[PDB]
Design a protein around this ligand. Structure first.
Ligand SMILES: [K+]
Ligand SMILES: [Mn+2]
Ligand SMILES: [Mn+2]
Ligand SMILES: [Zn+2]
Lengths: 117, 341, 618
DNA sequence: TATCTGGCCTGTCTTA
DNA sequence: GGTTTTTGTCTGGCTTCACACTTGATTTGCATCACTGTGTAAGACAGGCCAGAT
DNA sequence: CACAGTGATGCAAATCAAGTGTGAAGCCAGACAAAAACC
């Protein structure tokens, strides 16, 4: 974004308010009122010259039951938590290293007919 | 051996692969028409005479006592010495194999028109199962006559045959069959020398022996280059059959055989491989105890014959063969030639 | 800056223009509607739409606030493909283009429709035969089978010049039944029977066979096949269940001659007239069929095993093919009926009093009588004795009449009488070929002027349908001088139009009972008209189909209930599907054309698929 | 007498 | 210039959503194969033959 | 160098589905001010 003079004014006022009142949560509709009254010829010149530096910044800016692997990894999830992308990497490595997957595939074989029907 | 083109008359469509020619006193006749006999010729038998390279097929009639045999493709045909012809097996227009046997004999010859007698011979004992592509010949031993029948094909037996392969065929068991026409009985002989099944071979009969040449064995799918001699002895007791392999056998399936002179025959045509036709011709010289197979000069085949995939034919008898190759289709289906010797 | 249109602005921009009406709306909602601005704008918009007759957008917005997803099940996509005639290749264009514009996959991709097909084709459902079928395999996953059925093709054998594919007869039937399940259930229900009731059902099947000409041969390597096809089809005609001592019509085909229910069973490129190849290919089919006559098919419909017995009626055959497959002589012969032993001369003198005597069984006997000649007879006498049966039958047909060809042949005869009435042949016996040519040209021109019929080369179903009217006789009388013969023609046509409904309707008993009642009476006067006022044509001769029509129609009707529904016309209409599917629904190559057409022709006959298209008509 | 053109016919060739 | 309408910016936190990896299984996309049909009747020209004209 | 198909095959590419907490995008509030078109 590119920031007008009034906008720089409002930002600096928000910075002042935060440093004066740290534990304080500002309301927006009242803050725009008080900032607009403060803006409504010498004070504003600082913000006026700041805005052209921000314009230069703009120029710079332009430049189905699950797989047997799924049945196995769901259960092994708690042990890895005790030990997502990282969890799945570990799950896949240990599943690859493992008659081991015959029971999970029998459960999936029971579930395949149920998906079909 | 001179090759000659032949023209054909209005009923050229009758002539098909598996047809047969029979010779009665020099007059040739034709049997095995395509489709069932029509009212133009109810017997299915035709006087087959070629005059000046034009063939006219004219209907012949039967005797009152005759059977009306169905047209048969690839039956075993044989000449019997009073002259008569034996037809055994073959396919009917309905693709059934017939187990029957028929006898073709001239009943009458008044004013050069011939009436035939077709009588069915009943057969008991070890009757050969219905077949096509098989040989039958008559041997003479010690003043006795006996019929020999070898090889061929049939459909699967009723126990194993299934509709999905309803048309599958298998070689018959290679048992030699002695068949006495006098009594109507048949005797089967299993021989060690005849191990494989064989069909579409050539058969040559002299005295008490029959030579078995070439053929195709379905199980192996080979066209063996073997020759088998089969001798039959006719003593007062039960006859005995002895077989001998004799090397120097031709390799040809579906070849045609004709007799040029007594004791010399020519073997032409047929196939050496499924895609390779046998263009060479062989001469057989017979000795009372010996058989001689000699390469002879190949005929001047035309380019049609050379490049045809299939050819078919039969022997006309006077050392002249009637040949057929598939022709152009719209014209006439087959192109016919005559090769003389 | 002229105010832009409100739709062009950015969100922020449209906010500023509507901020005045936005605050005015938040009031209405808190005062009248519990502060539901969402539901008060949703309703104001929807109502604005239907105010401008824009119901579609409103109805869509409704579906998207409900949020239900839109997508067709694959089987429903299949039905739309199969029944609107789209090719996979065209349907893929439709699918792809919809999914790219909507962003949603309304239609399913082809691999799924191809999976949806599997249920609807033979070889998917399991069944068994008690007793087991003789000579048939008991495998149940047999789909499309090679139609040559292991026909030997080695160069020594007889030359194989056809390509053919088929279904296994039972496996096919099974697939038909399972296609009809819902219609079988609902047919019990409307008969007040138990859905789950499983007694001995009975399936009557119509068998049809025909040849086609003018089937072009493809380029490419393959058998050099003939330019003709043959088709064997069956239609499921009725199913009755035995509940007590009553047979309950669970199902009857509403449209017995529709292409929609003539199911394909065997396609071959071959010539019906080539007996050797015809029997080679069809004999395995007749064997399978023979086997099913002596077994009961137990098959599982809706959970409950049911049993089906089968009755086979071969009636969709033209007379040419009947005679060919039942060993009878060709239609030229003196033995003019395929239903009786009458002779052409006899049918001309008696005309009406003949009963049905021939049968597939009788014929088989008589061939054997022919072949063996047991009374050592002469060939004239032998042929007399066997009444022309001089070849061995191989297919069992009902002795009936095909309406389509009957209707055709009859009209073709009338077209001839018309000519010979124009030339006054009733009075001048001899006439040059040139003189007859012009009789036909006269009549041809006139049928065009008075009836809007262009001449056609060979006679037509619709031409017959339109020629055999009394209006056409009026037209034709304008060309005949003698009104004594206007009266003869008018009567002859009256009798015919009294008769025709008997052998064309589905239930004559219900649909023209007085035509059925009078048939023996009307057919006598027709016969007598031909014998007196039409001596010149009908002395000593009559046409095959006049005989069939005058002598055997009432017997047939009491044996079977209908003629018109056993007619070939359903199968002939199937030929039209053959030509289309070979062009536009098959791989375009010699070794795939038959099966692709066989399969996709079967789907087109599936009631399950057809049902989805009558869903609008709940 | 002794030729002689024109129709007539058939048959191929060029494009469809 | 005066005037009118589009787009913002300032802030803290509200919601909704895509992303993050891996494994094996489904589901889509896509190219590949050898073949399809639409190309389509009659006029120009020569050369033989024989009866009636020159 | 015609050209848009004709359906089945099979291999590559996409998608799926689960675990939870990251940041990113849009948004609200009042008030005033850039730009950007018009007399
Ligand atoms: K129709
Ligand atoms: Mn037909
Ligand atoms: Mn037809
Ligand atoms: Zn009759």
């Amino acid at each position: 974004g590119k920031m007008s003079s009034y906008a720089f004014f409002v930002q600096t006022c928000r910075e002042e308010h935060k440093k004066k009142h740290p534990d304080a949560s500002v309301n927006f509709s009242e803050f725009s009122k008080k900032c607009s009254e403060r803006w409504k010829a010498k004070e504003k010149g600082k913000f006026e010259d700041m805005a052209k530096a921000d314009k230069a910044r703009y120029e710079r800016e332009m430049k189905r039951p699950p797989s047997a692997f799924f049945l196995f990894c769901s259960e092994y999830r708690p042990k890895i938590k005790g030990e997502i992308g990282d969890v799945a990497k570990k799950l896949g490595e240990m599943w690859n290293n493992t008659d081991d997957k015959q029971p999970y595939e029998k459960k999936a074989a029971k579930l395949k007919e149920k998906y079909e029907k | 051996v001179s090759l000659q083109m032949v023209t054909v008359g209005h009923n050229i469509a009758l002539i098909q692969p598996g047809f047969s020619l029979m010779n009665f006193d020099g007059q040739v006749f034709f049997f095995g028409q395509k489709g069932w006999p029509k009212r133009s010729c109810p017997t299915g038998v035709f006087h087959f005479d070629i005059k000046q390279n034009h063939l006219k097929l004219k209907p012949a009639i039967f005797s009152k006592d005759s059977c009306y045999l169905p047209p048969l493709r690839y039956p075993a045909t044989c000449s019997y010495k009073k002259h008569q012809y034996i037809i055994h097996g073959g396919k009917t227009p309905n693709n059934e194999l017939s187990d029957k046997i028929y006898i073709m004999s001239v009943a009458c010859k008044n004013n050069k028109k011939v009436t035939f007698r077709c009588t069915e011979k009943d057969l008991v004992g070890d009757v050969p199962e219905p077949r096509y592509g098989h040989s039958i010949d008559v041997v003479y031993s010690r003043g006795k006559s006996m019929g020999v029948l070898f090889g061929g094909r049939s459909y699967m037996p009723s126990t194993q045959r299934t509709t999905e392969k309803w048309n599958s065929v298998a070689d018959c068991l290679p048992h030699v069959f002695l068949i006495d026409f006098e009594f109507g009985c048949a005797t089967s002989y299993i021989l060690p020398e005849l191990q494989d099944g064989l069909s579409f071979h050539v058969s040559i009969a002299r005295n008490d022996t029959v030579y078995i040449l070439g053929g195709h064995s379905l199980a192996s799918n080979i066209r063996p280059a073997n020759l088998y001699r089969i001798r039959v002895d006719l003593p007062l007791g039960t006859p005995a059959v002895n077989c001998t392999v004799l090397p120097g056998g031709i390799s040809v399936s579906s070849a045609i055989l004709t007799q040029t002179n007594n004791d010399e025959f020519v073997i032409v045509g047929g196939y050496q491989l499924e895609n390779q036709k046998r263009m060479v011709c062989s001469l057989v010289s017979l000795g009372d105890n010996t058989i001689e197979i000699s390469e002879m000069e190949t005929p001047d085949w035309t380019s049609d014959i050379k490049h045809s995939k299939i050819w078919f034919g039969s022997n006309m008898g006077n050392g002249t063969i009637f040949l057929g190759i598939p022709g152009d289709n719209k014209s006439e289906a087959f192109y016919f030639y005559t090769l003389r010797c | 800056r002229p105010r832009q249109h409100l739709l062009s602005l950015t969100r922020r921009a449209q906010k500023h223009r509507l901020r005045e009406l936005k605050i005015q709306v938040k009031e209405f909602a808190d005062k009248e509607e519990g502060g539901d601005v969402k539901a008060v704008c949703l309703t104001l918009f929807l109502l604005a739409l239907r105010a401008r007759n824009e119901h579609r957008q409103a109805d869509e917005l409704e579906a998207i606030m409900q949020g239900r997803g839109s997508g067709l099940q694959p089987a429903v996509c299949l039905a739309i493909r199969v029944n609107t005639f789209l090719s996979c290749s065209q349907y893929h264009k439709m699918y792809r283009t919809v999914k790219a514009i909507t962003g949603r996959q309304i239609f399913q991709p082809l691999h799924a429709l191809r999976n949806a097909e599997k249920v609807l084709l033979p070889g998917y459902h399991p069944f068994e035969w008690q007793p087991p079928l003789k000579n048939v395999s008991s495998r149940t996953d047999v789909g499309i089978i090679d139609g040559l059925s292991g026909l030997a093709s080695s160069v020594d054998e007889y030359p194989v010049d056809t390509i053919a594919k088929r279904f296994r007869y039972d496996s096919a039937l099974v697939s038909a039944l399972m296609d009809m399940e819902e219609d079988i259930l609902e047919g019990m229900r409307s008969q007040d029977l138990d859905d789950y009731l499983n007694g001995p059902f009975t399936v009557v099947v119509k068998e049809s066979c025909d040849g086609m000409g003018d089937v072009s041969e493809k380029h490419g390597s393959g058998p050099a096949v003939p330019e003709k096809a043959v088709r064997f089809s069956f239609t499921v005609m009725r199913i009755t269940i035995e509940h007590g001592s009553q047979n309950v019509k669970v199902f009857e085909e509403p449209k017995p001659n529709s292409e929609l229910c003539c199911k394909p069973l065997c396609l071959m490129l071959a010539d019906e007239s080539d007996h050797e190849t015809l029997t080679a290919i069809l004999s395995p089919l007749i064997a399978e069929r023979e086997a099913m006559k002596s077994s009961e098919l137990t098959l599982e419909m809706g959970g409950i095993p049911r049993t089906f017995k089968f009755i086979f009626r071969g009636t969709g055959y033209d007379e040419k093919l009947v005679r060919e497959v039942e060993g009878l002589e060709a239609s030229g012969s003196v033995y003019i009926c395929t239903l009786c032993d009458t002779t052409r001369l006899e049918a001309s003198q008696n005309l009406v009093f003949h009963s049905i005597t021939r049968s597939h069984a009788e014929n088989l006997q008589r061939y054997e009588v022919w072949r063996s000649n047991p009374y050592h007879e002469s060939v004239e006498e032998l042929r007399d004795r066997v009444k022309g049966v001089s070849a061995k039958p191989f297919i069992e047909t009902v002795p009936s009449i095909d309406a389509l060809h009957c209707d055709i042949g009859n009209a073709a005869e009338f077209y001839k009488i018309f000519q010979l009435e124009i030339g006054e042949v009733y009075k001048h016996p001899n006439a040059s070929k040139e003189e007859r040519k012009r009789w036909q040209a006269t009549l041809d021109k006139h049928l065009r002027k008075r009836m809007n019929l262009k001449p056609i080369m060979r006679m037509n179903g619709n031409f017959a349908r339109k020629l055999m009217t009394q209006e056409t006789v009026d037209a034709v009388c304008e060309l005949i001088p003698s009104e004594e013969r206007h009266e003869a023609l008018r009567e002859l046509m009256d009798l015919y139009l009294k008769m025709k409904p008997v052998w064309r309707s589905s239930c004559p008993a219900k649909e023209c009972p007085e035509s059925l009642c009078q048939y023996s009476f009307n057919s006598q006067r027709f016969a007598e008209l031909l014998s007196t006022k039409f001596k010149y044509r009908y002395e000593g001769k009559i046409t095959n189909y006049f005989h069939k029509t005058l002598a055997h129609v009432p017997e047939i009707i009491e044996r079977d209930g209908s003629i018109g529904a056993w007619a070939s016309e359903g199968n002939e209409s199937g030929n039209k599907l053959f030509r289309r599917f070979r062009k536009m629904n098959a791989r375009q190559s010699k070794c795939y054309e038959m099966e692709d057409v066989l399969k996709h022709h079967w789907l087109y006959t599936s009631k399950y698929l057809q049902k989805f298209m009558n869903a609008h008509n709940a």
